[PDB]
């Protein structure tokens, strides 16, 4: 429906420290020039943090002390578009960046939010994960999984048996390692009696590297039970 307020972000992605990125947000479902707009960000696992706001007409702007002098907010009212030019980027600027609309003529309180776009600032080069088995070996149920190690940037997706296996699956949030690469595991619990009979395959997809890895997880060869 054409009444739907939408704020669609773009221009995010990968950058090295010291580098630059320009975010864009294209709006619809309302008269763009009639509303103040803001950028708000959220570092992984952290809370909401306001970044910058701009008035209806675009000649007046406000910044958090964290980004002042590095970031510039602007708008083009003829294109329904809001911008965030981000210069001299640092690792601490890694976050999902949300475009938001101020709810009233005097307030930047956000009423509509975009889906957000991830910006990752790092020296690391894009790299697909290495995938290692967590072999099984408990009330007739066993645990197994895959270690999804050393990839960059976020995110990866993990499924089991091409998505046919979902019950008892837990896939952990990634942790950023001191190498600058990410790691996580995914585990699943299954009947022990199925081990060596049912095949278990973790399907690991990493869009940034265009990699897909299917790792079969089986009991160790030295396991005879």
């Amino acid at each position: 429906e054409i009444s739907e307020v939408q704020l669609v972000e773009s221009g995010g992605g990968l950058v090295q420290p010291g580098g630059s990125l320009r975010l864009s947000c294209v709006t619809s479902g309302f008269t763009f020039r009639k509303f103040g707009m803001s950028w708000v960000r959220q570092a992984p696992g952290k809370g909401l943090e306001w970044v910058a706001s701009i008035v209806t007409g675009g000649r007046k702007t406000y910044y958090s002390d964290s980004v002042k002098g590095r970031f510039t907010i602007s708008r083009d009212n003829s294109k329904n578009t809001l911008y965030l030019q981000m210069n001299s980027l640092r690792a601490e600027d890694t976050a999902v960046y949300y475009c938001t609309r101020g709810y009233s003529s005097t307030s930047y309180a956000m009423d509509y939010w975009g889906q957000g776009t991830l910006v990752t600032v790092s020296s690391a080069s894009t790299k697909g994960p290495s995938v290692f088995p967590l072999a099984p070996s408990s009330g007739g149920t066993a645990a197994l999984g895959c270690l999804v190690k050393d990839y960059f940037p976020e995110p990866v997706t993990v499924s089991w048996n091409s998505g046919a296996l979902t019950s008892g699956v837990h896939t952990f949030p990634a942790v950023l390692q001191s190498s600058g690469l990410y790691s996580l595991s995914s585990v699943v619990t299954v009947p022990s009696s199925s081990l060596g009979t049912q095949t278990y395959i973790c399907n690991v997809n990493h869009k940034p590297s265009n990699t897909k890895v299917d790792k079969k997880v089986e009991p160790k060869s030295c396991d005879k039970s």
């Binding site: 306001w50 406000y62 009423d111 290495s130 290692f132 645990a143 942790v175 396991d223």
Partner: protein, 214 residues
């Protein structure tokens, strides 16, 4: 800058129960208090706007109250879809500032973790690293301690923990603790153990293996 302090950090309640969340400000904000709900992987949603007004379309069980420096969000009777993180925001002046968040969490009965330990795979060792993984599966409540011992020596600084969101079906948590070593360091020792302490266990539980055997 205006400081917003939320309380409590986590609130554990059952569906059907009333929830009262608190936001205190460091100075007056002309009642320009706003409340947001956020679920994992989604954008925040506005619930209450300046002047303590419920946003149209938002369920009637949500309400905002308070003035001066002392504000409250109340959910009269929790529904399953209400378990989430809630943030306050002052829109009185710049910089606009958010509270640090309150997690409203699903209360359930205590459940001890099932603990599993996984040595590094041959394939990982071939690439020159060793990750030892300790899995704590399906436990409640969230608080759990995991300690690593290598040849009975307590480790520190070389492990990382990760926790899932509450399970959609049974409302439990699972946690991984991963000990990371170079292959060379892994080969200097024989016995690997992870020790788990949790309210649901009558004593700590250790899972272990020896590098010299299957």
């Amino acid at each position: 800058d205006i400081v917003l302090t939320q309380s409590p950090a986590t609130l554990s309640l059952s569906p059907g129960e009333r929830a009262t969340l608190s936001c205190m400000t460091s100075t007056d904000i002309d009642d320009d208090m706003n409340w947001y709900q956020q679920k994992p992987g989604q954008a925040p949603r506005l619930l209450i706007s300046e002047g303590n007004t419920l946003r149209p379309g938002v369920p009637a069980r949500f309400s905002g109250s308070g003035s001066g420096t002392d504000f409250t969000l109340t959910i009269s009777s929790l529904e399953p879809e209400d378990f989430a993180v809630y943030y306050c925001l002052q829109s009185f002046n710049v910089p606009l500032t958010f509270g640090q968040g309150t997690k409203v969490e699903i209360k359930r009965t205590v459940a001890a973790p099932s603990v599993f330990i996984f040595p590094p795979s041959d394939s990982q060792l071939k690439s020159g690293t060793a990750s030892v993984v300790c899995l704590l599966n399906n436990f409640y409540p969230r608080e759990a301690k995991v300690q690593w011992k290598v040849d009975n020596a307590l480790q520190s600084g070389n492990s990382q923990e990760s926790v899932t969101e509450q399970d959609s079906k049974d409302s439990t948590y699972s946690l991984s603790s991963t000990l990371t070593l170079s292959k060379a360091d892994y080969e200097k020792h024989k016995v690997y153990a992870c020790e788990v302490t949790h309210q649901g266990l009558s004593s700590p539980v250790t899972k272990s293996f020896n590098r010299g055997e299957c």
